[PDB]
């Protein structure tokens, strides 16, 4: 946590240019308590200008970009396929059946 | 204790297969008997 | 509907309908079903089958229902297809009841947590506390195997779940699962300041609320005897009422 | 009739069926829907009873002092001259008085 | 629980071991062997299999 | 009920199975260093079965 508002990050290498990685993130507005424009993630960590659900672990703990929240029966791997084909078979069979429903009689 | 498992075709497919087999045998024996009766009558 | 996946149901219905069409095309196109009508029939000549679309469809339904039917299929073809149909039905409904038995019993036999060790054997519901709030520190110095492994798990998480603020962890528990080990007193206060929150287990630790006095203190024994009186009167139980029980019984829903 | 339709409903709830079967389509809707509900029911019942018969979570009627302080079919107890009787003597408090008396 | 009472050690007024034993009891509770020995001499066979 | 109890129950395969379990009884050639090992064992499971 930076106490001030201006950051200073220096890195030293000594023919170790392959030092695996220094990959880190800085967060603004860590300073203010809540106002509507901003968003609470931790104690006095209301920060939001736009980082509400920014797809990055944008706060100390997952609170900001973090768990913000009849077509499914259509989307089957092949159950939808053979199911609708079976429905087609059904329809054709019904077409056939109504004939002998209406056409024939006794002897 | 995790076995909150809705049964799916992956555990029940066999009855449909038996169903198709029965349907084909039905067609077979039905046409066989109909033509058998037709030939016997003549 | 739960024991069966929301696909077979549709498979069930479509199979019923297709079977029914098969049945009727078997019956009205058959060399046998055609029948002499009269109860005392001297070889009449108005014979016919006895199946409709309506009849065969409902028969298929009813056999799928385990409630019989009205048509008595007669010939080889109709009887064999009906046999397969009956097999389909019995196996499906049997399997259904088995699965529902499965859910209800696997439910009933679950044991919701009720003790700290039981929590330790748990894995999904996480542990932790307000960091270093003298609470996890006891775990740090803990010698009990349950608490030893509890601290081992907390060291595994190691700020993965170690909330900084009591209320922040309160929200954590409200929105998810958590253990959130912390002092009893505030727990009963909060629980009877709210709902959804329960005391679980006993007093894992034991601490006391005394009165601080310097080494030189004549008032020590005097105030101790005073509080012994107030306790033996139950009067301090009464004042507990005042501050918790009085404001800790607005919320029994 | 009313008599036989009633008899059909009751005998159909249980799995036997009646032979006043629906001759017409309209009445067959009722017959089918009724069959569905009853099968739901009987299977559900068998499942749930299987659920109890093999888990048998025993239950205690009483879980707090006030709880049996309000019923009367269970007798309390204490040692004579037991300090239990002394603290419960001079109950001083909400409910322990009824029990002491 | 309904009441709240504790058990102490027999000592007359002002005996020299008084605060010396208060601090010892506090420490022993802190290391928790109070719990361990209480469990050990109150353990018994434990609950068998009620399954 | 019978079938689910039967399939549910489990044949033992571990020492701690015996540790928790109480119906069946252990066995050891006493003084063959076996029971000496158990009594010298400080492992809570072997400790409790030894006791």
UniProtKB/Swiss-Prot annotation, chain A:
Superkingdom of the source species: Eukaryota
Compartment annotation: Membrane
Tissues/organs with expression: Brain (at protein level).
Organism: Rattus norvegicus (Rat)
Residues covered by the LDL-receptor class A domain: 33-69
Sequence intervals crossing the membrane: 79-99
Gene: Neto2
UniProt subunit comment: Interacts with GRIK2 and GRIK3, but neither with AMPA-nor with NMDA-sensitive glutamate receptors.
Glycosylated residues (UniProt): 48
Post-translation changes: N-glycosylated.
Its job: Accessory subunit of neuronal kainate-sensitive glutamate receptors, GRIK2 and GRIK3. Increases kainate-receptor channel activity, slowing the decay kinetics of the receptors, without affecting their expression at the cell surface, and increasing the open probability of the receptor channels. Modulates the agonist sensitivity of kainate receptors. Slows the decay of kainate receptor-mediated excitatory postsynaptic currents (EPSCs), thus directly influencing synaptic transmission.
Residue pairs linked by disulfide bridges in the UniProt entry: 34-46, 41-59, 53-68
Protein name according to UniProt: Neuropilin and tolloid-like protein 2
Covered residues, full protein: 264 to 376 of 525
From Swiss-Prot, chain B:
Residues bearing the modification Phosphoserine: 38
Membrane-crossing segments per the record: 12-32
Subcellular location per the Swiss-Prot or TrEMBL entry: Cell membrane; Postsynaptic cell membrane
UniProt PTM: Sumoylation mediates kainate receptor-mediated endocytosis and regulates synaptic transmission. Sumoylation is enhanced by PIAS3 and desumoylated by SENP1. Ubiquitinated. Ubiquitination regulates the GRIK2 levels at the synapse by leading kainate receptor degradation through proteasome.
Domain of life per record: Eukaryota
Tissue: Highest expression is found in the olfactory lobe, piriform cortex, dentate gyrus, hippocampus, granular cell layer of the cerebellum, and in caudate-putamen.
Family: Belongs to the glutamate-gated ion channel (TC 1.A.10.1) family. GRIK2 subfamily.
Additional notes on this entry: The postsynaptic actions of Glu are mediated by a variety of receptors that are named according to their selective agonists. This receptor binds domoate > kainate > quisqualate > glutamate. It does not bind AMPA without coexpression with GRIK5.
Name of the molecule in the record: Glutamate receptor ionotropic, kainate 2
Source organism of this protein record: Rattus norvegicus (Rat)
Gene designation: Grik2
Coverage span on the entire protein: 809 to 850 of 908
Curated annotation (Swiss-Prot), chain C:
One record GO biological process: modulation of chemical synaptic transmission
An example Gene Ontology CC term for this record: plasma membrane
Expressed in which tissues: Highest expression is found in the olfactory lobe, piriform cortex, dentate gyrus, hippocampus, granular cell layer of the cerebellum, and in caudate-putamen.
Single GO MF annotation: ubiquitin conjugating enzyme binding
Protein location: Cell membrane; Postsynaptic cell membrane
Coiled-coil residues: none
UniProt KW keywords: Cell membrane, Disulfide bond, Glycoprotein, Ion channel, Ion transport, Isopeptide bond, Ligand-gated ion channel, Membrane, Phosphoprotein, Postsynaptic cell membrane, Receptor, Signal, Synapse, Transmembrane, Transmembrane helix, Transport, Ubl conjugation
Post-translational modification: Sumoylation mediates kainate receptor-mediated endocytosis and regulates synaptic transmission. Sumoylation is enhanced by PIAS3 and desumoylated by SENP1.
Cytoplasmic topological domain: 28-83
Glycosylation sites: 196
Family per record: Belongs to the glutamate-gated ion channel (TC 1.A.10.1) family. GRIK2 subfamily.
Protein name stated in the entry: Glutamate receptor ionotropic, kainate 2
Species this protein is from: Rattus norvegicus
The encoding gene: Grik2
Residue range from the parent sequence: 556 to 808 of 908
Swiss-Prot record, chain D:
Coiled-coil residue spans: none
Consequence the record notes for mutating residue 15 to R: In RNA edited version
Binding site for L-glutamate: 83-84
Free-text tissue specificity from the UniProt record: Highest expression is found in the olfactory lobe, piriform cortex, dentate gyrus, hippocampus, granular cell layer of the cerebellum, and in caudate-putamen.
Subcellular location: Cell membrane; Postsynaptic cell membrane
Transmembrane regions listed in the UniProt entry: 33-53
PTM annotation: Sumoylation mediates kainate receptor-mediated endocytosis and regulates synaptic transmission. Sumoylation is enhanced by PIAS3 and desumoylated by SENP1. Ubiquitinated. Ubiquitination regulates the GRIK2 levels at the synapse by leading kainate receptor degradation through proteasome.
Subunit note: Homotetramer and heterotetramer with GRIK5. Tetramers may be formed by the dimerization of dimers. Assembles into a kainate-gated homomeric channel that does not bind AMPA. Can form functional heteromeric receptors with GRIK4 and GRIK5. Can form functional heteromeric receptors with GRIK3. Interacts with DLG4. Interacts with NETO2. Interacts (via C-terminus) with KLHL17 (via kelch repeats); the interaction targets GRIK2 for degradation via ubiquitin-proteasome pathway.
Annotated family: Belongs to the glutamate-gated ion channel (TC 1.A.10.1) family. GRIK2 subfamily.
Protein name per its UniProtKB record: Glutamate receptor ionotropic, kainate 2
Taxonomic placement: Eukaryota, Metazoa, Chordata, Craniata, Vertebrata
Included range, full protein: 607 to 707 of 908
């Amino acid at each position: 946590m930076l106490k001030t508002g201006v950051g200073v990050i220096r890195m030293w290498a000594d023919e170790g240019s392959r030092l695996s990685r220094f990959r880190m993130l800085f967060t603004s507005f860590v300073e203010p308590p809540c106002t509507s424009s901003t968003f609470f993630c931790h104690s006095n960590m209301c920060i939001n200008n736009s980082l509400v659900c920014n797809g990055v672990q944008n706060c100390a703990y997952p609170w900001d970009e973090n768990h913000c929240k009849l077509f499914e029966q259509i989307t089957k791997t092949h159950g939808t396929i053979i199911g609708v084909t079976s429905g087609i078979v059904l329809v054709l069979l019904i077409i056939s059946i109504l004939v002998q429903v209406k056409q024939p009689r006794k002897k | 204790s995790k076995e909150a498992s809705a049964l799916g075709v992956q555990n029940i497919g066999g009855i449909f297969i038996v169903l198709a087999a029965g349907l084909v045998l039905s067609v077979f024996v039905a046409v066989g008997e109909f033509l058998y009766k037709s030939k016997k009558n003549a | 509907l739960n024991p069966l996946s929301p696909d077979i149901w549709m498979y069930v219905l479509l199979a019923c309908l297709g079977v029914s069409c098969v049945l009727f095309v078997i019956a009205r196109f058959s060399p046998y079903e055609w029948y002499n009508p009269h109860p005392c029939n001297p070889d009449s000549d108005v014979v016919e089958n006895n199946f409709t679309l309506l009849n065969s469809f409902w028969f298929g339904v009813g056999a799928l229902m385990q409630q019989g039917s009205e048509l008595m299929p007669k010939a080889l073809s109709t009887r064999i297809v009906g046999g397969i149909w009956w097999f389909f039905t019995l196996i499906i409904i049997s399997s259904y009841t088995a699965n529902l038995a499965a859910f209800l019993t696997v439910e009933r036999m679950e044991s919701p947590i009720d003790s700290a060790d039981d929590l330790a054997k748990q894995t999904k519901i996480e542990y932790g506390a307000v960091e270093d709030g003298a609470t996890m520190t006891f775990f740090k110095k803990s010698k009990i195997s349950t608490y030893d492994k509890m601290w081992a798990f907390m060291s595994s998480r190691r700020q993965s779940v170690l909330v900084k603020s009591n209320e922040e962890g309160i929200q954590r528990v409200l929105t998810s699962d958590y253990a959130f080990l912390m002092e009893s007193t505030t727990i009963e206060f909060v629980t009877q300041r709210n709902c959804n929150l329960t005391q679980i287990g006993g007093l894992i630790d034991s601490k006391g609320y005394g009165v601080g006095t310097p080494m030189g203190s004549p008032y020590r024994d005097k105030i101790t005897i005073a509080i012994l009186q107030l306790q033996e009167e139950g009067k301090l139980h009464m004042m507990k009422e005042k501050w918790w029980r009085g404001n800790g019984c607005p919320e029994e829903e």
